[PDB]
Amino acid sequence: KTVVVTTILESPYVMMKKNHEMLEGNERYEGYCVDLAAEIAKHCGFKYKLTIVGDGKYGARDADTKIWNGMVGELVYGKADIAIAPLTITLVREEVIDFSKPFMSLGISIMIKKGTPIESAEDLSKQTEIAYGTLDSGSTKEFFRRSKIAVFDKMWTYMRSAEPSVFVRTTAEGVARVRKSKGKYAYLLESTMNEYIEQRKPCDTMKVGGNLDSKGYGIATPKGSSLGNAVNLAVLKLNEQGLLDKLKNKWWYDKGEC
Ligand SMILES: N[C@@H](CCC(=O)O)C(=O)O
Ligand SMILES: [Zn+2]
Ligand SMILES: [Zn+2]
């Protein structure tokens, strides 16, 4: 009866409260998705339990075993009843799980250390001094793996063979790499996360160029779940009322430190 929510520790969507050790259950977390989960649950009339995805991944299907990992996997195999996180709506995922209409719009973008002589994806593709990569088991990596677009095709050709690996396990790892590489590493990540980090000390990174694509994050449920319909209506109601915009301002800019 209590709905099991799978989510991921990704700032500012879900973060551990400073005093989480003295708190219980859902109260241990804070963030955009924590606030949204409470609202979705309230509007859909269900009790829930926030759980962090075991493998800390978003969701990809292994080409060899064909098994789904990450939050998608937890939904596919029945470990969670719903995923409320910055989970990108994609065709391959839509084929195995259901997604609500987008609660956030975004696109792949470029994050550089301030001062890096890069202004676009084309710029990155035409040079070799500056390395660049993406997150693992995510929609961004898949975007490049599948792109038939010349520029992105070139970029994938480079990234998949670059040594040492230009891929990272978590967004935080990618951000740290940019900050410590003296401008020799640029990170490809969704505009949402890029924009957030841009407003965080040490204020040494910035988003450059236009988004490479346009898509959205959706609340996901197991294929054919009974919660799907209500969850989708709730997302639309909250967006139409202005809550989603308020929540983004709250976690991105209201407490911006740059
Ligand atoms: N939002 C992405 C993860 C982040 C990324 O791939 O850049 C996903 O659902 O896979
Ligand atoms: Zn802790
Ligand atoms: Zn409400």
Cα(122)–Cα(102) distance, integer angstroms: 28
> 22: CA distance to ligand 1 center in Å?
31
Experimental method: X-ray
Angle of helix 32-44 relative to helix 228-241, nearest 10 degrees?
120
The helix-helix angle for 139-146 and 150-161 (nearest 10°) equals 110
Task: State how far the Cα of 146 lies from the Cα of 29, in Å rounded to an integer.
Answer: 35
DSSP track, 127-140: -SSSEEE-BTTSHH
Q: What is the resolution of this structure in A?
A: 1.5
Give me the residue label for tokens 């970029």.
Answer: 155
The H or E element spanning position 109 is strand 108-113
DSSP three-state, residue 94: helix
Domains present along the chain, CATH in parentheses: 1-106+216-255 (3.40.190.10), 107-215 (3.40.190.10)
Q: Please, how many CA atoms are within 13 Å of residue 91, restricted to the half-sphere of its CB?
A: 3
The residue type of 107 is G
Residues with CB under 5 A from ligand 3 (ion): 39
Q: Whose CA is nearest to atom 3 of ligand 1?
A: 138
The number of the ligand 1 atom at minimal distance from the alpha carbon of 134 is 7
Name the strand (E) or helix (H) holding 194: helix 191-198
User: DSSP secondary structure string, 23-87?
Assistant: S-GGGGEESHHHHHHHHHHHHHT--EEEEE-TT-----B-TTT--B-HHHHHHHTTS-SEE-SS-
Contact 154, 144 (CB under 8 A): no
